[PDB]
Ligand SMILES: CC[C@@H]1CO[C@@](C)(CCO)CN1C(=O)c1cc(OC)c2oc(N[C@H](C)c3cccc(Cl)c3)nc2c1
């Protein structure tokens with residue numbers, strides 16, 4: 346992932 | 357009522373670096 | 384954006400990123416029009432020729448962002464979609480006429496220095512500002528050239544182009560629901576949107592009331608930044624009846 350991980354709550 | 361007046365620009369009477377290019381095009 | 388420059392912090396606080404959950408990628412741009420409503424291009428969500436058919440749960444909206452890839456903790460806000468509304472006469476088959484969609488967020492977003500809605504024009508604003516030669520501004524995290532990706536939000540200012548000139552640049556049928564923008568070959572400046580910028584805003588600053596208005600949605604171009612071609616934008620004012628209807632109903 347080029348993208349940084351998002352907090353789990355948003356997924 | 358407050359749409360798009362930018363907190364870091366219009367709200368503080370600061371201009372971004374190129375908004376004057378837009379203004380100068382409006383005759 | 385091609386031949387643009389890095390956005391200043393807080394310069395475009397209505398810019399939204401549509402972010403695909405799986406796999407984690409940039410889907411498109413969009414814009415914040417209130418605390419619960421986000422505007423984008425229909426083809427960002429639905430486009431059968433590329434097998435694009437996104438449901439609510441496939442996507443997140445990321446607002447207040449600057450960096451393309453970093454999780455901007457306690458700056459950006461990430462929101463879930465309640466419902467997607469595509470214009471019922473969106474014409475993907477021919478010309479991307481009515482390339483517009485709305486998204487209602489599950490919860491209202493908190494405004495901040497970095498997060499603030501753009502205005503939608505009324506008839507008089509459109510009449511005043513949507514004139515050949517008048518420049519607007521196009522923002523996004525799309526590619527830096529046709530064939531790479533920016534670290535931070537990119538800006539470019541671009542002049543609206545005369546209707547006959549738009550028409551004569553393309554084989555596609557251009558409708559009254561579209562305008563085009565970009566420099567001509569002789570001009571000595573250039574710039575365009577490019578892959579990943581679709582659905583983002585074309586904005587103008589009213590000299591009458593000093594507010595920013597979203598006059599266009601980034602829709603399409605034949606490549607990016609090619610000499611003799613222009614960008615085609617959805618004309619927001621012309622589809623405002625529809626916008627108002629969706630928001631009034633829902
Ligand atoms: C060149 C003609 C063909 C057949 O006709 C049409 C109208 C699509 C028909 O569905 C457009 N088209 C395409 O190849 C095409 C399609 C798109 O979405 C389906 C596109 O989305 C974008 N977005 C990029 C960011 C962009 C680049 C430069 C300026 C602008 Cl304003 C936007 N470019 C596209 C080009």
Ligand SMILES: *[C@@H]1O[C@H](CO)[C@@H](O)[C@H](O)[C@H]1NC(C)=O
Nearest residue numbers: 429430431434435436437438
């Ligand atoms: C897109 O998906 C929805 C349900 O997910 C479906 O009802 C609709 O007909 C689909 N359109 C396509 C695949 O073109």
